[PDB]
Amino acid sequence: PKLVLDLERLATVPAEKAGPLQRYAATIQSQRGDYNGKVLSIRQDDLRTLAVIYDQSPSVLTEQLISWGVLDADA
Amino acid sequence: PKLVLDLERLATVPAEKAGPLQRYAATIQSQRGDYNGKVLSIRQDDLRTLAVIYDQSPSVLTEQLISWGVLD
Ligand SMILES: Nc1nc2c(ncn2[C@@H]2O[C@@H]3COP(=O)(O)O[C@H]4[C@@H](O)[C@H](n5cnc6c(=O)[nH]c(N)nc65)O[C@@H]4COP(=O)(O)O[C@H]3[C@H]2O)c(=O)[nH]1
Ligand SMILES: Nc1nc2c(ncn2[C@@H]2O[C@@H]3COP(=O)(O)O[C@H]4[C@@H](O)[C@H](n5cnc6c(=O)[nH]c(N)nc65)O[C@@H]4COP(=O)(O)O[C@H]3[C@H]2O)c(=O)[nH]1
Ligand SMILES: Nc1nc2c(ncn2[C@@H]2O[C@@H]3COP(=O)(O)O[C@H]4[C@@H](O)[C@H](n5cnc6c(=O)[nH]c(N)nc65)O[C@@H]4COP(=O)(O)O[C@H]3[C@H]2O)c(=O)[nH]1
Ligand SMILES: Nc1nc2c(ncn2[C@@H]2O[C@@H]3COP(=O)(O)O[C@H]4[C@@H](O)[C@H](n5cnc6c(=O)[nH]c(N)nc65)O[C@@H]4COP(=O)(O)O[C@H]3[C@H]2O)c(=O)[nH]1
């Protein structure tokens, strides 16, 4: 399963919920110099680190991102 | 030193030296379905994967990769 984020839906999720995801995605973009600004695919191991940053299980985290329509239901 | 590979350069490299790396390249491109240019950039840690498959030190591998013109 692929992990693809919607950069445009993400930007409008309030910081209180999405702040740490937004900052994480920004550090990847800066490192990449990847500023397409529509979509961002991350490594499957980036999910474990986000889950730690969010303090949830990778599983709980995924379902939340999907619930926001940021992460394609494919994952 | 970032691993940006010139696939067009490496093709012209004789098979008994370029082979493993050509075949490694091709596996990565198949993993990503990345078939849109003559350049392949790979992970810095892949250097070790490669030094293992070639059974040479990273140092060695990296320096003949530059003579070959495959790397910058
Ligand atoms: N800028 C960007 N676009 C994304 C991202 N995720 C998905 N896409 C879009 O979705 C397709 C597949 O992305 P992919 O799984 O990364 O799979 C990609 C990726 O593996 C690779 N690829 C394409 N361009 C580049 C590149 O500039 N650098 C690297 N390192 N790989 C690339 O080729 C595969 C197919 O690329 P395409 O089908 O032509 O086009 C893309 C691209 O239009 C992302 O994080 N950033
Ligand atoms: N060792 C190695 N393995 C490789 C390489 N390229 C691809 N793979 C493997 O193939 C999977 C799919 O690559 P992808 O479609 O480009 O899909 C990639 C891709 O769109 C993007 N991605 C991950 N890392 C990078 C990166 O450093 N740069 C860019 N531009 N995109 C990345 O995140 C997606 C998921 O990444 P993964 O879960 O890791 O899943 C990756 C990874 O297991 C490589 O150069 N070296
Ligand atoms: N996961 C993913 N990431 C993407 C995709 N398209 C672009 N990117 C990201 O966006 C950066 C800039 O892409 P670019 O300058 O348009 O243009 C790229 C591209 O023209 C070319 N390039 C270098 N390496 C590769 C490669 O392995 N595959 C491909 N298809 N192009 C590459 O050099 C420039 C910089 O390459 P990068 O260092 O890889 O840096 C890429 C990469 O991090 C994509 O479809 N999927
Ligand atoms: N399509 C595709 N290309 C891949 C993948 N892995 C590596 N690459 C390519 O190989 C490059 C160097 O990978 P790196 O040493 O891991 O160096 C990477 C890595 O340290 C980091 N980075 C980029 N994207 C991601 C990511 O999604 N997750 C993580 N944890 N680190 C990333 O920033 C670096 C520079 O990224 P780039 O400019 O994009 O340059 C990337 C990219 O062109 C992959 O799974 N799929």
Author numbering:
A (entry chain A): 83 to 157
B (entry chain R): 83 to 154
What does the report in the manuscript say about this coordinate set?
Here, we report that c-di-GMP can assemble into a tetramer that mediates the effective dimerization of a transcription factor, BldD, which controls the progression of multicellular differentiation in sporulating actinomycete bacteria. BldD sits at the top of the regulatory cascade controlling development, serving to repress expression of sporulation genes during vegetative growth (den Hengst et al., 2010). Specifically, structural and biochemical analyses show that the second messenger c-di-GMP activates BldD DNA binding by driving a unique form of dimerization that is mediated by a tetrameric form of c-di-GMP.
Three S. venezuelae BldD C-domain-(c-di-GMP) structures and one S. coelicolor BldD C-domain-(c-di-GMP) structure were determined to resolutions of 1.95 Å, 2.33 Å, 1.75 Å, and 2.25 Å, respectively (see Extended Experimental Procedures and Tables S1 and S2). The BldD CTD uses a previously unseen mode of c-di-GMP binding in which two noninteracting CTDs are glued together by a c-di-GMP tetramer composed of two interlocked c-di-GMP dimers. Further, mutagenesis of either BldD motif 1 or motif 2 abolishes c-di-GMP binding in DRaCALA assays, confirming that, unlike I-site c-di-GMP binding, both motifs 1 and 2 in BldD are required to construct the complete binding site for the tetrameric c-di-GMP complex. Overall, these data demonstrate unequivocally that c-di-GMP binds the CTD with a stoichiometry of four c-di-GMP molecules per CTD dimer, concordant with our structures.
